[PDB]
Structures are given as structure tokens and as C-alpha cells.
Amino acid sequence: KVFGRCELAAAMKRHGLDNYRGYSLGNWVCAAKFESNFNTQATNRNTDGSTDYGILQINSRWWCNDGRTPGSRNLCNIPCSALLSSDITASVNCAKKIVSDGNGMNAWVAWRNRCKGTDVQAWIRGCRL
Fold this sequence. Notes:
The protein starts with a helix and ends in a 15-residue tail after the last helix. It has a single domain (1-129), classed as Lysozyme, CATH 1.10.530.10. The chain has helices at residues 5-14, 25-36, 89-99, 109-114; strands spanning 43-45, 51-53, 58-59. α1 (5-14) packs across α2 (25-36). A 3-stranded antiparallel β-sheet has the order 1-2-3. By secondary structure, the protein is mainly alpha-helical. Its EC number is 3.2.1.17. Pfam families: Lys. GO terms for molecular function: beta-N-acetylglucosaminidase activity; identical protein binding; lysozyme activity. It catalyses: Hydrolysis of (1->4)-beta-linkages between N-acetylmuramic acid and N-acetyl-D-glucosamine residues in a peptidoglycan and between N-acetyl-D-glucosamine residues in chitodextrins. It is found in: Secreted.
């Protein structure tokens, strides 16, 4: 599913990401924009053999099982395919664990490089939320 921007904002809000670990909704929308372009089906292989999955590009070395990543820890206790669903529940639940891991949203390199320090509330402008 390719979400619209306000569509995704409403879904993330419904699932409790607005202000989660102190990150306002616009941070999470911005992160999804630059991780996946709001596409839940996005996948990208990494150099270490892991793959990133879904709207927030969550990685198979630590977080989900894809059956082909050695040293996999599966800390979210989910198959990585669950992160590609049109239903963002699994992605949100796992993102909540990731952002709680100690480095906050710096865990998402696209957030650090394209969102952090910017006017992230622009990502929710116009939306009825």
C-alpha cells in the first residue's frame, strides 16, 4: 500500500506514535517519507546481508525474521513480511521498540540525515487529525 501523507499521519496517530518517546507525529511521517516513500511494500538489501522492510525500513538482523539473515535476533518476534502489510500495526509496534532502544530516532539513518533538525511539523500540514 502506498499511503497518502495525511492518510499515514492519521494511521500513525491512531496507533499512538504521535509523541511516542517524545517524537512528534511529523518526525514519524518524515521518517516514512524518506525511508519508503510511504510504501509499505518497500524492501532494500543491506551490505551485511540483512534487508530493510516496510514503511519504516526495519532491519532483519535485529528486529524481524526473514529466513536469510545470519545472526538474526528477531527482537520484534515477527516475520519480516508482516512489515509489508497494508495494515501498519506490526511496523508501528516494532518501531516503538526500536525508538525505545537508546538512540531514539537516530536508529533511522534517513531520519537523521533528512528529518532531524528540520521543520518536521510541515509533514502534517493540512491534515485533519
